[model samples]
Target: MDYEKFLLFGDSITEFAFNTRPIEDGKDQYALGAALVNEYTRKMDILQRGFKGYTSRWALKILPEILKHESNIVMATIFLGANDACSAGPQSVPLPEFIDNIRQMVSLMKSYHIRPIIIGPGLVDREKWEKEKSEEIALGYFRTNENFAIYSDALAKLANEEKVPFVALNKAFQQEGGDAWQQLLTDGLHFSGKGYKIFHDELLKVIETFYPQYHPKNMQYKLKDWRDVLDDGSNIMSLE
Candidate 1:
C-alpha cells in the first residue's frame, strides 16, 4: 500500500504532541516533542490537528473545517473530551453527545476514505496532582480523572462496535500510576519527554495491530520497557 499522509487531530496534548522548541536557552528545543517525522510513519506529510483547550463539542465544530482538507489523508487520529470535563464550569460532554461526536468524526473520515486511528484521552493523576498543586486546580484535575473513566469506557465499546483501531491511552496511562505520570508530565497535565515516550509505546501497540508497516524502524518490541526500542539506534539519552 502506498504510504498516505497522516493527520493528528486532538486537544492540546495532541496539538503539542511534538515540541519543536527548547525548554531553556534551547539550541535544539524541538528535541522534546515526539511528533517526529521518522518515529511513527515512514514518510509523507504529517499534519498536527491538535488544538489547546478544546472540548469534544468544540472539536466537532472544528473538525469539519479540517476534513475539508482531508483529500490525501490516509490516516487520522481523534482525541477529545478532556476540556469538557474541566473542573471550573463545564463538567463533561453528555455521554450521548460525546458518542455522537466520535461517530460523526469516524463517519466523516471514512467518507473521505481515510482510516481513522482513534486514541482515547490521556489519563490524569488526580491524587498526585492534588498533592502538587493548588486546591482550585486540584478539584478540576480530579474531576477530569473521574470523567476519563466514563469517556474511555465508552470509547472502548465504540471501537469494538465500529471495528475501528482504538488506542487505549487513558487505560495505559492510568496503569502507569501517579509517580510514573508525574515524571512524564511537567505540571501533571501536559506531556514531557517521558510522557511522549509512554505515548510512543501505546502508539506502537496500535500500529502492530492495524498499521504495522509504518511502525518505527528498529523498534525493540520488548515487553520489559518500551524505551528499549531506542536501543536499536543510539542511546536515547545521547539525543537528550
Candidate 2:
C-alpha cells in the first residue's frame, strides 16, 4: 500500500480541530481532526495546516511551500472565508479576489496531482457574536452572515466550475435550522464540538462521493492485519 495523505487547510476552525479541553459534563472538546485521523488510522495520514486569523490571500502566498510535490497528498480540503469575510477588518478580501484566490489554490493543488476539495464558511450567530466580544472589537471586525454568504457561494461556484468536491457548509447550517448557530458555533465565529462534527461528516461525504477510492473502507491498509500475520513473523512487516 503506497502512502497517501488527506490534508485539511484553513483558519482557526481547522487549527483548533485537534484541541482538547474539559468543559461542561467533562466533555472532550474539538476532537474532529482526531476522529478523522482515527477513521483512517492505518490507511492514510491526515495533515492539518490551519493558520489562525488567515484569509485566502495569506494562504495563497504560503500554499506553494506547504503543498509541495512528492507529498503524496491524495486530497486537500481548502476551508477559508471566515477571516476573508470580515468586511470591517484588514483581513477582509473582496468577493472577486477571494474567488480568484481560491481558484488559484485549486490550480496549484491540481499542479501537484492533489485533488482539491472546497469547504465554505459556516454561518455566524449575530447575537452570540455581540455577547461574546466587546462593542469596539465587534464593530472593528464586523462580519455578518450576509457577508459570509457571498464568499461561501463564490467558493461553491468555483468548485463547480473546476469540477472539484465542495461542501457548502453555510447552506447546510441553514437547512439544519435557526438553532444551528448556537448548536454549531462556539463563539458565533468558530466551530463548537457539534459544528466540527457536522464539518467532519460533510468532509467525509465529499470524499466518499468524489474520491470514493480514498474512503476509509475502500482504501488498503498499510502492512497486514493482525490475524493475517504469520506465526513466523515473515509477513508481519510486509505491506504486500
Give TM per candidate: 0.74, 0.92
Total clashes in model 1, counting residue pairs 3 or more apart in sequence or in different chains: 5
Clashes of each: 5, 0
Give candidate 1 misplaced runs (Cα > 4 Å): 1-3, 20-35, 40-42, 87-91, 127-142, 174-179, 213-240
Model 2 agreement with the true structure over 193-224: per-residue lDDT tens digits: 77787788888888889989988979877787
Stretches off by above 4 angstroms in model 2 are: 22-25, 135-140, 177-180, 237-239
Candidate number with greatest lDDT = 2
As a whole number from 0 to 100, the lDDT of residue 124 in candidate 1 is: 67
Worst 10 residues of 2 by lDDT: 19-28
Model 1 agreement with the true structure over 1-240: per-residue lDDT tens digits: 344577788888787777754145354323223555655443545777888878777888888898786567877778776665554555357778888888888888888977777777676665565666666564553446667777778888887787788877666765764555555565566666666666767776786688665555533322334546365755533422
